[PDB]
Amino acid sequence: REAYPGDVFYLHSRLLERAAKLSEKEGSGSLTALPVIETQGGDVSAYIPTNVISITDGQIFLEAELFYKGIRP
């Protein structure tokens, strides 16, 4: 779709699932991930954010319209 490859959802899967809190018997180590996505014109319908938002454990969506009314960030 959109001339992206067929498995770009699989590309973001095996990146954003290698970061997770281990159990105690492994030593309670942790890797915590913050991917950052540039989008196009205030949109979430595009194929890359619609793949990634379904993977990641939430979102901090950052409208520019709220930026220009002084709300920093």
Partner: protein, 269 residues
């Protein structure tokens, strides 16, 4: 700028065009209703101001200002025009008391002068007002506001000069003490034993505030009808823009998915 966003906004603005058209028609119906009350105020007010023309009651030398606007909004350039006329007249006498009739001019003047306002009438513009409401407010001015002590009284109303024109207007109220000081007063045989100025002043207050209400009401509804007319016309125009955006979005979407259907059908084994 999806197809879905443009279609949703086109549906909402087609609803806004239809609703503003209905509001224009309903306001035109109430305007054809309230022309009757405007004529019944004016043809009656002539029969008492003609006396004040012949009995020339010109006053001389702590003032009351009363404005007649709406409780609702959405009539356009009325709610700030009459407030601005209050401002011009009110910088001359900053210590003068103010009794607003209407919610919107109250929220105007309370924002700029919360010290002047002493009485506020609310609950007016649901109908063309009758003599009972205006006479009852005329009693409330002389039961709690004590307007008889006031030398000078002016009423600000909204004057529809024509259908597409309007006017804020001053209308003075001569108090009963002034009427004996009138140079043209003794022509009229009046009693000394009947307190006729002391009652005619209250009757003048009654019919002048009735003319103010049944003229500012028609002025409100005419300006509101004009505002809804401009709303319907602008809604029609911006629908003629968003339909063109809708058609360009649909054609660009069908082409920009047919491209990526075809692109797979050439990179085969």
């Amino acid at each position: 700028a999806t197809l879905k966003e443009v279609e949703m906004r086109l549906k909402s603005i087609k609803n806004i065009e239809k609703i503003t058209k209905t509001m224009k028609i309903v306001a035109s119906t109430r305007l054809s209703k309230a022309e009757k009350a405007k004529i019944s105020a004016k043809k009656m007010d002539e029969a008492e101001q003609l006396f004040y023309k012949n009995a020339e009651t010109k006053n001389l030398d702590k003032e009351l200002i009363v404005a007649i606007t709406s409780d609702k909004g959405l009539c356009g350039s009325i709610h700030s025009q009459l407030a601005k006329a209050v401002r011009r007249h009110l910088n001359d006498q900053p210590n003068a008391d103010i009794v607003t009739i209407g919610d919107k001019i109250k929220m105007q003047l309370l924002r700029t002068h919360p010290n002047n306002i002493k009485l506020s009438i609310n609950g007016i513009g649901k109908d063309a007002p009758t003599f009972q409401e205006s006479a009852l407010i005329a009693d409330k001015l002389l039961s709690v506001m004590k307007a008889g002590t006031y030398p000078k009284i002016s009423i600000f109303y909204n004057d529809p000069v024509s259908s597409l024109s309007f006017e804020p207007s001053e209308k003075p109220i001569f108090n009963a003490k002034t009427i004996e000081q009138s140079p043209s007063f003794g022509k009229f045989e009046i009693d000394t034993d009947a307190n006729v100025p002391r009652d005619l002043f209250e009757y003048t207050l009654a019919n002048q505030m009735l003319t103010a209400m049944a003229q500012g009401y028609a002025a409100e509804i005419s300006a509101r009808r004009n505002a809804m007319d401009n709303a319907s016309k602008n809604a029609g125009d911006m629908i003629n823009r968003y339909s063109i955006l809708y058609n360009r979005t649909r054609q660009a979407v069908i082409t920009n998915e047919l491209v990526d259907i075809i692109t797979g059908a050439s990179s085969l084994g």
